[PDB]
Amino acid sequence: TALQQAFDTCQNNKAAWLQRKNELAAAEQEYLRLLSGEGRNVSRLDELRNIIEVRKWQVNQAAGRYIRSHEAVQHISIRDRLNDFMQQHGTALAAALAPELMGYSELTAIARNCAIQRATDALREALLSWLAKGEKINYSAQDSDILTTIGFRPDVASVDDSREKFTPAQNMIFSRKSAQLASRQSV
Amino acid sequence: TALQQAFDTCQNNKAAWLQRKNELAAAEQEYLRLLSGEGRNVSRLDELRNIIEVRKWQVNQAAGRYIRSHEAVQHISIRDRLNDFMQQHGTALAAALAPELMGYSELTAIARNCAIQRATDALREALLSWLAKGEKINYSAQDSDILTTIGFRPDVASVDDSREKFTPAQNMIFSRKSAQLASRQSV
């Protein structure tokens, strides 16, 4: 049931990222409205700029968390699907790889690594040959709905908000500022 | 049908390498016979040493040629077996690997390479799990005999005889010496 946990964790990350995005958008629009209002509220403008930047940092963090959760759920789905496929086709698969897979138990570390590398890149070449002809690849029937709901790739609105990286000092400063802002807004 | 050409090239390499080995052994035992005797055949001993050196070089070259041919025939057999198994179960493997394999045709170079790497090392992890659970696998049914006469690995003699390497200058000098020796023996 770990796949369901990954799925709904990704859904929660999507929800949190969207909530952060609309909060930032509302703060941006009210900041522009107040700036265009010819108001003598310099302190108000400064603290709204601070809120804007805190919201941007929170949006970046949420987008990164959602992207990593998407990667994790895709990876676990791949693990399970390939695991059952290989569990069912393993006799033929290892028969096709007998010349460099037998004796794996007693082979040395360097020999084992060389053999698995040769098997791995030969299988890579086979995958490339199969993909060359240009057919259509479909989701597994058991796990089609979850992958369709999650999507093949994360939304482009999640990668453009994570293209810039924050230094650890910036990260901790923004964490303190966000905590202070949350405490102030809670009152 | 190149597998048969690889296999009888392997057999011819047996012929050549065994001929080099037993000719070198005969020359070595004859040299030791003449050295043990009281005969003052210093020129004979010198030319015998030259012959022994060029025969060791020829044995090394033959062992290297065997290693190359054996690796080539194993690679061809692996490619053919992967082609057959992949044409058999590509739909299932694509259903397993769909989360990052569909759309590969229109993806950019870097994305294509990253997806290939992720699929490839996921398959490597699956193969490691199969090896870990400890089930033994025999050779391919279709091509069992061709790859069981040649053996799982090249002979230990072909390995330790080819362990030492020669710089290209040594290779060309030894080629010239071998040509001169062949010309002298022919007449």
Author numbering:
A (entry chain e), B (entry chain f): 4 to 190
Question: Which statements did the authors publish about this structure?
Answer:
A ρ variant harboring a P167L substitution has been observed to bind Psu more tightly than wt ρ38,43. Consistently, we observed a more pronounced shift in the SEC elution volume for ρP167L-Psu mixtures, even in the absence of nucleotides, as compared to wt ρ. We, therefore, also determined cryoEM structures of ρP167L-ATPγS-Psu complexes. The results showed that ρP167L associates with Psu in a similar manner as wt ρ, with a preference for the complex II constellation. In complex II, two hexameric ρ rings are bridged by five Psu dimers that connect ρ(A) subunit 6 with ρ(B) subunit 2, ρ(A) subunit 5 with ρ(B) subunit 3, etc. ATP or ATPγS are bound similarly between all neighboring ρ CTDs in the ρ-ATP/ATPγS-Psu or ρP167L-ATPγS-Psu assemblies. The ρP167L-Psu complex exhibited a ~seven-fold higher mant-ATPγS affinity compared to ρP167L alone (Kd = 2.1 µM). The mant-ATPγS association and dissociation rates of the complex were more than five-fold and ~40-fold lower, respectively, compared to ρP167L alone. The drastic decrease of the mant-ATPγS dissociation rate in the presence of Psu suggests that, once nucleotide is bound, Psu effectively hinders its release.
